[PDB]
Each structure stands twice: as structure tokens, then as C-alpha cells.
Design a protein around this nucleic acid. Structure first.
Ligand SMILES: Cc1cn([C@H]2C[C@H](O)[C@@H](COP(=O)(O)OP(=O)(O)OP(=O)(O)O)O2)c(=O)[nH]c1=O
Ligand SMILES: [Ca+2]
Ligand SMILES: [Ca+2]
Length: 430
DNA sequence: ATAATGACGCT
DNA sequence: AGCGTCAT
């Protein structure tokens, strides 16, 4: 009825950089531009692990987590750039810094939530309402939306991609309710215009291309974003949700890509996101818990309330290294030395962080993984972080994990460690 | 023998 | 406090 909330109160975008580490390497090395190429860490073992893949290389079947030697088998022309290595581990500084370039530019338009090294949510509600004043009911030209897809359109009465895009946009714009400043669809459309500008600015000032989703909440925006990649943006309207969700595999919806998603599928005996509508909120709550049941009930109707959190800086700073199989650390001296290598990178980055962002970390968290254990972390322990000093931090870290050592001989370490992880947390202003 | 990161929920 | 889930 008239008391039915429709989740159309906000305009929310998610921006995501196209094959981000590859673009960073391609900006720096013009030889890699418009070529099949990939970013790889380490190179001794099977040519290194691939962690990012240009879209040209994707067309050959090259994927993440592939060994580089295996990728060459699919794509013999594949060009590689390798991650900087410092102190025997990967060093992602180039990408973190590239990330800051993009984030500060987006920050110029609106409050952003940094969702990863190359993704940000944008709450555009205020900017849209303001822009809606700039245009005194003035119709929105197709030319303000040159890279925008309208999900679900064209419908009813062209054989190439751009032809379809435009026909969809035209059908959308022709039906638009422009003399109504409260029309959710109009707000989204104005939201999409701004995101075009934001994306133009990002490309102009960094050289980096990205894709974006624009919708009424974060989950739909994130979904919308992946529908037309690379270098394009997608508007997903509230109206588009029933058809879109009608064949949308549950695992595609953010937070449903793991075990909860799988149990939703198994317990309810369904496949697609829209099928969730046929259950009461109480039923969903009984199967998955109050919080999940409530969230599921709203979400399958395109309604979600998770706000864009005003946070542009990460809340933790960490360094980890895995030591798979034969490389697992087996002596005290190895464990101490690698904790030191981790502590040294951490200290550089913390000192940087303290000068840039006026804050200090107050807690050190130490995480290890023992051989045979499938879990990410075998064990987590903490101590105070009182000095940005590598030798102290590495020493304290050893102290809080050292009795995990089950070995009879003091110089030996067992069970061998397959991962070391140090993370600085609990920042206070400074 | 993917990695190296991150955010947050549950108890 | 410490472990588990989900994501890039
Ligand atoms: C998913 C993932 C990404 N990354 C890095 C490399 C990616 O370039 C970057 C962001 O990842 P994604 O956004 O997941 O991937 P992408 O940018 O490479 O490609 P797409 O265009 O499909 O978005 O972070 C990892 O190091 N490990 C990972 O598991
Ligand atoms: Ca990306
Ligand atoms: Ca991403």
C-alpha cells in the first residue's frame, strides 16, 4: 500500500577500477598498454602467481591465481609486470598510492566509503538534490550519459553493443518524469550524470578507467557495476529489480557469495534471488537468524539500508606473507627474521600514516597459520603498540606467539608456520 | 604452492 | 579477547 517502503530514499554509487594493478603498471609502462598483460608476484615458482589480468588477456582465458607459466600456455604473447619485492615479500605501495589518487578525486564530489584498494561507495543523495536545482526541470540529454547502461532496457519494439545501449537510454530518457524532483528514477538519472563526471575526472587526472553502478543502495550498486565492464556504468532502477532478480543466481549478491548463500540455496531449495520473495520474514528469520532473515526479506525486493560510511582511510595497516609447503618456517631463527622483515615494512607504512593522517596505532595483532590447518588464521594474539620500532614490534610479536612452539628442541619450530601476519589497529588521533 | 591484504560478526 | 565469514 501507501505504507510500503520501497528503498528509494538514497542515490548510491559503487565505483570500481578496471583491472586495477594492470592499469597502474600500464600507466608507468606504455609498452604494456592495449596488450594482453598480467601482474604477477614472485617468479621463481612457475613464473609467479598472477593477481591481475588485462581484459585483452582475459579473452585468452587467463585468470587470477593462475601460474604465469600456465597463462603463457593459453596466451603465448602475454606481457608481464611484477610486483615490487622488498625484504623478500610483496610490496603493494605503488597500488596503495595509485588508490589514494583515485579516492581523493572521488572525495571531491561526495562522502565516500573506501571498500577496497580500488572500490568506493558514494552516497550521492545530497549532490543529486542540489543538481536538481541547477536544472529548472530541464530535460536530461543522452549526451550527458555517454557511457551509461539502463538495466532492463531496451524492451519491446540493433545488432551491435552501442546500438542497444543507446536505444535503452533513449527509451529510459523518453519516459522520464522530469518535472517531479521527488521521482526516484529521476534522482538515479541525475546520479548517473554525476558519476559520468566523476569518471571523466578520474580518467583525465590519473589516466585510469573504471566502471560504476548507480542505484538506491550499496548491494544493487555493486551488482549494477559488474553488469557492463570495463569502462562503462550501469543504472539499476527499483523497477528493474524483479526481472533482474528473477534469473540472478543467489551467490552474486554481496555477502551471499559464501556459506550463507549456499545454505540459502540448500535449505530453501531455490536458485535465484527473486525466489526469496515467496517466503515470510519470519520464515527467513527462522532459517538464517533475525538479522539475516530481515536483510534477506528486504534485499530480494531491492531494499537495503546499510549506509555509506564516511571512511576514506583503512582502519588497519597490515603485512602478511605465506610460506607454503616446503618453505614453511621450521626454526626459531626463521620465525624471528621474518617477523622482523614484516615489522620493518609495517614501521615504514605506520610512520607514513602518522605524518599523513594525523593518527597512531595503539595495538599490534599477531596472526599465524600452522602446517596442515586449512583456516586462514591458526591463532591470533595482541600486545600494546607503543613505539613505531621494527625491532620492538617484531620482538613483542615473537613473545606473544612463542609458546605455540610445540618442539622439544629450542632452536626448532614445530608445527612449521605457513603464514606470518602483523596488523596495526586501534588508531587514536594524533 | 595463490597472495596480500581488508571489514566486520559472533561469542 | 579470540575465532569465523566474506570480500578485493
Ligand atoms: C580479488 C583480488 C584482487 N587483488 C588485487 C588485484 C586487483 O587488480 C585489485 C582489485 O581487484 P578486483 O577489483 O577484484 O579486480 P580487477 O581490478 O583486477 O579487475 P576488474 O576489472 O575485474 O575489477 O586488487 C588481489 O591482490 N588479490 C585478490 O584476491
Ligand atoms: Ca576492480
Ligand atoms: Ca574491486
Amino acid at each position: 500500500g501507501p505504507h510500503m517502503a520501497t528503498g528509494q530514499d538514497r542515490v548510491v554509487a559503487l565505483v570500481d577500477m578496471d583491472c586495477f594493478f594492470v592499469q597502474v603498471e600500464q600507466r608507468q609502462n606504455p609498452h604494456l598498454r592495449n596488450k594482453p598483460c598480467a601482474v604477477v608476484q614472485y617468479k621463481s615458482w612457475k613464473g609467479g602467481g598472477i593477481i591481475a589480468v588485462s581484459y585483452e588477456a582475459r579473452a585468452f582465458g587467463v585468470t587470477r591465481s593462475m601460474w604465469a607459466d600456465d597463462a603463457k600456455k593459453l596466451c603465448p604473447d602475454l606481457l608481464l609486470a611484477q610486483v615490487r619485492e622488498s625484504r623478500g615479500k610483496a610490496n603493494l605501495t605503488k597500488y596503495r598510492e595509485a588508490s589514494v589518487e583515485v579516492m581523493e578525486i572521488m572525495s571531491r564530489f561526495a562522502v565516500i566509503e573506501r571498500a577496497s584498494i580500488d572500490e568506493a561507495y558514494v552516497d550521492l543523495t545530497s549532490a543529486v538534490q542540489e543538481r536538481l536545482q541547477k536544472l529548472q526541470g530541464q530535460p536530461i540529454s543522452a549526451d550527458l550519459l555517454p557511457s551509461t547502461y539502463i538495466e532492463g532496457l531496451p524492451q519491446g519494439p540493433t545488432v551491435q553493443k552501442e546500438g542497444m545501449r543507446k536505444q535503452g537510454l533513449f527509451q529510459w530518457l523518453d519516459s522520464l518524469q522530469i518535472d517531479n524532483l521527488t521521482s526516484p528514477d529521476l534522482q538515479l538519472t541525475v546520479g548517473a550524470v554525476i558519476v559520468e563526471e566523476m569518471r571523466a575526472a578520474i580518467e583525465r587526472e590519473t589516466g585510469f578507467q573504471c566502471s560504476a553502478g548507480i542505484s538506491h543502495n550499496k548491494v544493487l550498486a555493486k551488482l549494477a557495476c559488474g553488469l557492463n565492464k570495463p569502462n562503462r556504468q550501469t543504472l539499476v532502477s527499483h523497477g528493474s529489480v524483479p526481472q533482474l532478480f528473477s534469473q540472478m543466481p543467489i551467490r552474486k549478491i554481496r555477502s551471499l557469495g559464501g556459506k550463507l548463500g549456499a545454505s540459502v540455496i540448500e535449505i530453501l531449495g531455490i536458485e535465484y534471488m527473486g525466489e526469496l520473495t515467496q517466503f515470510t520474514e519470519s520464515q527467513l528469520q527462522s532459517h538464517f537468524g533475525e538479522k539475516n532473515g530481515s536483510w534477506l526479506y528486504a534485499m530480494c525486493r531491492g531494499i537495503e539500508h546499510d549506509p555509506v560510511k564516511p571512511r576514506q582511510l583503512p582502519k588497519t595497516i597490515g603485512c602478511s606473507k605465506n610460506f607454503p609447503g616446503k618453505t614453511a618456517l621450521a626454526t626459531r631463527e626463521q620465525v624471528q627474521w621474518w617477523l622482523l622483515q614484516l615489522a620493518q615494512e609495517l614501521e615504514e607504512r605506520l610512520t607514513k600514516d602518522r605524518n599523513d593522517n594525523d593518527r597512531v596505532a595503539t595495538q599490534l595483532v599477531v596472526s599465524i597459520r600452522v602446517q596442515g590447518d586449512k583456516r586462514l588464521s591458526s591463532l591470533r594474539r595482541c600486545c600494546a603498540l607503543t613505539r613505531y620500532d621494527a625491532h620492538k614490534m617484531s620482538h613483542d610479536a615473537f613473545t606473544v606467539i612463542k609458546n605455540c612452539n610445540t618442539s622439544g628442541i629450542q632452536t626448532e619450530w614445530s608445527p612449521p608456520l605457513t603464514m606470518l601476519f602483523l596488523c596495526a589497529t586501534k588508531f587514536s588521533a594524533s
